[PDB]
Amino acid sequence: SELDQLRQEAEQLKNQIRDARKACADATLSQITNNIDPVGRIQMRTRRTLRGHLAKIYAMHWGTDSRLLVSASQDGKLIIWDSYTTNKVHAIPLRSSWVMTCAYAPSGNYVACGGLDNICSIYNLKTREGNVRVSRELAGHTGYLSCCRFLDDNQIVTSSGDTTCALWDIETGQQTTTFTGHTGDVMSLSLAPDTRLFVSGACDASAKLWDVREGMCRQTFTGHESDINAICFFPNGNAFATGSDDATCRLFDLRADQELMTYSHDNIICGITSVSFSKSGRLLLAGYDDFNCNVWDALKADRAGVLAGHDNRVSCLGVTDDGMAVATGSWDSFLKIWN
């Protein structure tokens, strides 16, 4: 078996990478500089109760306008909420229930969703007919559609099961650039504000950073022992937090190619479910399968704040596109706006 030589080559290259990272591994000045810019004790207040949903709110999502947040129930209804007035801009019934992802276009015009149906649907919010009609359906992800994100009003990425994050051309409905490097199914996907590097986590705990342009796996990060749930890309595009099935969350850096720093505590044991970054990114807001959700000083790993409890697990976090407030899509069928 000549494959022995090839696997040994892979192993020694991996060891070389580990050595380079250790050389990269110096004192984490940020936590060393814990004395500087301490985020203090931030008490975060809920102010809106978007109780229109009834099923579990699997995935919420904000809009580029930073006022309309689209949320998907488990039962198959998308509610495009008007955060600032508690009003429901829309309520879309979905052909198939069991949806866990809601994608808002980078225009405020389209919305995409996907789930165990193994198909990502894109709905045109604004049409001459005056209603909301399904625009495109995307099939080919033989596995469930875990998370999707809109690159453009014709370009979308759909992290799914079947171990792929295929890039879909909306108009043709064709996946363009596959990402087959993963081994376990994908349950997360985070876009860089640059919209050129997106990080996808999988059950193999391998947070692979990909280049949107070629399909190549730019980087692989593995600091989490368990399956990776949610990835919130840092506001600069140079780093990102990554939460996993473990109670811990770990901030990785692209330039450092390694986990910059970690976020865990004794009192927290429930697996993570949602990670978020404040406007600056200095606040690492994390939602837990625990009813409570918290926020850490992103560069000091200490509990920056605790969010008032819900009646059920949080299931999705989204900060305002401007970071004014953050909505906590929880399984108790209530989105709560926090500012």
């Binding site: 000549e2 494959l3 090839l6 696997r7 892979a10 290259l13 991996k14 070389q16 990478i17 380079a20 050389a23 990269c24 591994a25 110096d26 004192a27 984490t28 000045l29 940020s30 936590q31 060393i32 500087i36 810019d37 985020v39 102010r47 809106r48 006022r67 955060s83 600032y84 490097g181 190549m216 796996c217 730019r218 980087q219 840092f234 506001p235 600069n236 140079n238 780093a239 850096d253 330039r255 450092a256 190619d257 390694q258 910059l260 720093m261 404040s278 406007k279 600056s280 990114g281 200095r282 606040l283 992103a298 560069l299 900060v319 401007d322 970071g323 004014m324 407030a325 953050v326 500012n339």
Partner: protein, 63 residues
């Protein structure tokens, strides 16, 4: 194929390649990267609405 372990030649090749580009990736030192990210956050910490408590006259929730 099966004898090649599902053409494990290709899987090993792509693994080797990805590790190669990872090696080619610059390693900004952890202290350096942390300093950079902290500097950016501070440059934006004073403007973050969550970090900076907005008075209840500008937020769209006690407008």
């Amino acid at each position: 194929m099966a004898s090649n372990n599902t053409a494990s030649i290709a899987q090993a090749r792509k693994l080797v390649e990805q590790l190669k580009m990872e090696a080619n990736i610059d390693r900004i030192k952890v202290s350096k990267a942390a300093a950079d990210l902290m500097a950016y956050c501070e440059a934006h910490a004073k403007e973050d609405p969550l970090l900076t408590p907005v008075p209840a006259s500008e937020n769209p929730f006690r407008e």
